[PDB]
Design a protein around this ligand. Structure first.
Ligand code: CL
Ligand code: NA
Length: 139
């Protein structure tokens, strides 16, 4: 139940409803070495559809690896424009040390239909880069 439409301070409209997951989630491109046995599942604004092991929390980001599943953050905030670059933040996932896992997707306006890619693990935060045409200002 999160709005996928945001207007930045400068007045640029962003519309991410085209990335919303109605039936199946997004699958993250991961060419890391730690990505051999791990799959990241992602959704924009909407919670993930049923994925075994991360049900119950309106999970927006699920790591599935070797049978086990981890909740990497729930959908609460809308995509944040805050200079013109888009970001969405899922936090308060499964326990990660003294904190909880979180997921950040950084969007970049690119004239292509892109898929989110795993970029970085910053402690308990999983960082994703999404270069795609939907990250561009709407009319
Ligand atoms: Cl779909
Ligand atoms: Na289950």
């Amino acid at each position: 139940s999160v709005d996928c439409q945001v207007t930045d301070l400068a007045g640029n409209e962003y519309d991410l409803t085209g990335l919303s997951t109605v039936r199946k989630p997004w699958t993250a491109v991961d060419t890391s070495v730690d990505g051999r046995k791990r799959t990241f599942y992602l959704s924009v604004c909407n919670p993930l559809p049923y994925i075994p092991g991360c049900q119950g929390s309106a999970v927006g980001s699920c790591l599935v690896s070797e049978g086990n599943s981890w909740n990497l953050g729930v959908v609460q905030m809308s995509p944040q424009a805050a200079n013109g670059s888009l970001s969405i933040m899922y936090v308060n996932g499964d326990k990660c040390g003294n904190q909880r896992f979180s997921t950040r997707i950084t969007f970049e306006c690119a004239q292509i239909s892109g898929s989110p890619a795993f970029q970085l693990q910053d402690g308990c935060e999983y960082v994703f880069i999404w270069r795609t045409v939907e990250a561009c200002p709407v009319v």
